[PDB]
Amino acid sequence: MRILVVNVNTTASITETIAEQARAVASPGTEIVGLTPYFGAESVEGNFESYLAAIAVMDRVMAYDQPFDAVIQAGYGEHGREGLQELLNVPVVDITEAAASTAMFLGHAYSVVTTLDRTVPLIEDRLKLAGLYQRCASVRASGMAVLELEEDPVAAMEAIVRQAELAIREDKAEVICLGCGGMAGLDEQIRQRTGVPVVDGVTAAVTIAESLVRLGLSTSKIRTYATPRPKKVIG
């Protein structure tokens, strides 16, 4: 099968890293295609940039010419999932929901550790909408400005594990979810350091996407995600 894995931000280096991580868990016969949107912010930080990224991602998927069997939106706490669901006749998985949903099988309560404080309420709102928030102990920001993870990977790792530890100790999280795709593959280190399973939405999304295809499942087109009624649309 073919799975499109779309970055929500325009940074080509992040697309390839995410895609690589998707390729490391993909099943035999699964082809992962990483896609960079044509427009949008280099890192998606806030409501404005999130809504720009929602249509950036859908523009990017609707440009792809080859057949494909699933789409993964590779961004934590951003908009657009639902619009993809309407546009496409294949399953869509967003990594936010892939992480929280897989975490819920593992523990009484899960926490998410993201980058910026200002992205906490967007991630919270995404999960509440998904109906996944009941078992979320908290969504916590490490505080590192997105691009520093390649500059100081040590200061980053430390800031992240400090939040993981507060979530386990104060919020009673039993599993940690990564909260920017740019965190893919750092999960073993966080596990080594906390003694809890640590879910990476990128890899979790691949398995859920692969599963829905194996099960013959796709978005319901009955109501909310009906194909859009063809009409006059500009631009």
Within residues 110-129, the interface with a second copy by CB under 8 A covers 117-118, 121-122, 125, 128-129
Consecutive H or E run containing 92 = strand 92-94
CB of 87 to a second copy, least distance (A): 5
Asked if residue 67 binds a second copy (CB under 8 A), the reply is no
Interacting residue with a second copy among 82, 148, 165, 171 (CB under 8 A): 82
Pick between residue 17 and residue 126 the one whose CB is nearest to a second copy. Answer: 126
Instruction: Name the one range near a second copy by CB under 8 A: 13-21, 36-44, 156-164, 178-186.
Output: 36-44
Phi, psi of 159, rounded to the nearest 5 degrees: -60, -40
Asked if residue 170 binds a second copy (CB under 8 A), the reply is no
Interacting residue with a second copy among 27, 89, 189, 192 (CB under 8 A): 27
CB of 31 to a second copy, least distance (A): 17
Three-state SS at 30: coil
Asked if residue 104 binds a second copy (CB under 8 A), the reply is yes
Residues 22, 3: Cα–Cα separation, whole Å: 10
What single letter denotes the amino acid at residue 179? G
Residues 6+ apart with CB under 8 A from 29: 1
Distance of CA 112 to the CA centre of its chain: 12
Instruction: Name the one range near a second copy by CB under 8 A: 13-21, 150-158, 159-167, 208-216.
Output: 208-216
Q: Using CA of residue 173, residue 139, residue 78, residue 43, what is the dihedral sign?
A: negative
Instruction: Name the one range near a second copy by CB under 8 A: 15-23, 150-158, 177-185, 194-202.
Output: 194-202
The answer to whether 140 and 165 are in contact (CB under 8 A) is no
Q: How many residues bind a second copy (CB under 8 A)?
A: 90
Phi, psi of 214, rounded to the nearest 5 degrees: -55, -35
Stretch 135-164 residues interacting with a second copy (CB under 8 A):
135
Interacting residue with a second copy among 107, 179, 181, 182 (CB under 8 A): 107
Pick between residue 10 and residue 15 the one whose CB is nearest to a second copy. Answer: 10
Asked if residue 171 binds a second copy (CB under 8 A), the reply is no
CB of 168 to a second copy, least distance (A): 7
Q: Which long-range contacts (CB under 8 A, 24 or more apart) does 52-57 make?
A: 53/8, 53/9, 53/78, 53/79, 53/80, 54/78, 54/79, 54/80, 54/83, 55/80, 55/83, 56/8, 56/10, 57/6, 57/8, 57/84
Asked if residue 223 binds a second copy (CB under 8 A), the reply is yes
Interacting residue with a second copy among 49, 96, 179, 184 (CB under 8 A): 49
Using alpha carbons only, how large is the chain's radius of gyration in Å? Answer: 17
